[model samples]
Target: DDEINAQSVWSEEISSNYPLCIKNLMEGLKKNHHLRFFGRQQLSLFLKGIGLSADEALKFWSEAFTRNGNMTMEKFNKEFRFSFRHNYGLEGNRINFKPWDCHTILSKPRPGRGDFHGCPFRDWSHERLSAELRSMKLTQAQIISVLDSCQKGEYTIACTKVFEMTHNIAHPNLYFERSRQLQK
Candidate 1:
């Protein structure tokens, strides 16, 4: 009954399409056979933090990973399954790894080629960030201020600003919570 136990434990933090960050990361994962290491790690823990049990996490990631046929279920089982279990505290140190906070995400190393990990505010190029903000339908002024916050190295502040403009929240898990509240 670990699934039920997990559900009770994270009863307050559910899943939704309202978390734009998760949406973006998921889109990236579906296109590639799988995201690179950091991208996979971030999204995996985020899903767990948002209440997906390890079984569900495996199925979810396996679906995405095998979509292209380059990676099979067996490949995922061998190469990626344990990490999800670890995130759920079922493996490794049995430490229930929480989803990363905004600070931790912002502090991660910048994305390399084919990588889409870390906070967009901290990791995206100026143009790409601005483009995303515009598509988020931010007003020109709002976009400028958000971009400015990034330039000033106030990444979390920038995230919050974007949050304000758009739930609009951060710590993607926390962001999901805020949106869930707002939807009520």
Candidate 2:
């Protein structure tokens, strides 16, 4: 929050409302649920990393990947997919990576200039944060009280006001680690 210049803490957590990628994918049940596993060493890396048995996981992979012809999965092997070899110590050394901490997302680059993730609190300008707050059912006084200081760029003071006004310990605990991660 202090050093590099960014939004303070968990202001991004305006609402837990979600985006619907998986739902839309499932809704296309016009397609189907559960598909084949990815074949080869790639498959070996993933299932084993999550602690499955070697014989069973490898058998599982071989069975699924061989049949699953390309109707939907065009790029399972491309882009962000990691290799099974790496996780199994054939390609890389030592151990595989751990999953992402939710806080780690705050510092990752935002989507491309024109596109946006739905979090108005983090992604939008102060101007829009106000409007989005209004739409989310915040009272006019509540909106003005929380955002006015932030709009003037007194962000920490503003956030503290929220913590004070809401009288909740959970929000601070939830936001504290996000600042710690963002610090480094």
Candidate 3:
């Protein structure tokens, strides 16, 4: 029933991968309300990475906070560190780094002692990915959609899509194109 509910609400509107992530996050939010702090930060960063507008980002935050309760930036930072930093070895001010920093490190690369590799999300193996997806209660189609989206070859589109879907933000095409060339 929960999986069905999730499918009905999210399967049509969002990419399968994103919904899976959101379901896991929302579960965390529901079970441990205090974790809303970390979820807010992660959501903000995720929305921004996908390219949502500031206004939209703030709007989403407002709605989320309304449901989740008033979480000051300060409290969010503290909770976030307690929840994740020690496991990852993040440094600098606990509140200093943006959500993107945590998102990148968690999704892209394994964080070294000092280096900020991207997030661990991008590096999950097929088994790990499947297990996580199952825990999130996403359907097989949703998982496939997410994996397909992740495997898409066009970096610029991928980046822009992230901004658009998350926060309705759009990066400048020229800038994205220029950056892509540099990757060569």
Top-TM-score structure, candidate number: 1
- The order by descending TM-score is 1, 2, 3
Clashing residue pairs for model 2: none
Model 2 accuracy (lDDT, Cα): 0.37
Candidate 3 RMSD computed on C-alpha atoms after optimal superposition onto the true structure? 12.2
Cα lDDT of model 1 by residue, 1-184, tens digit: 4533333322433334234456657668767868887778788887777677777776677777788687878988899878767777777575667787776776678777788787777767889888887877888899889889989988878877777887443478777667656857
lDDT of 3 by residue, 52-160 (tens): 4444444344344335456665665554434343222244334433344323324443434332223323544556655775564656775565556556633334333
Model 3, global lDDT: 0.42
Clashes of each: 0, 0, 22
Query: Is 2 or 3 the stronger prediction by lDDT?
Result: 3
Highest lDDT scorer: 1
* lDDT value, residue 26 of candidate 3: 45
Considering TM-score, which of the candidate structures 2 and 3 is the better prediction for this target? 2
Tell how far residue 33 is off in model 2, in angstroms.
18
| lDDT by residue for model 2 (111-132), tens | 3443332123344576665665
10 residues in a row with least lDDT, candidate 3: 168-177
TM-score of 2: 0.35
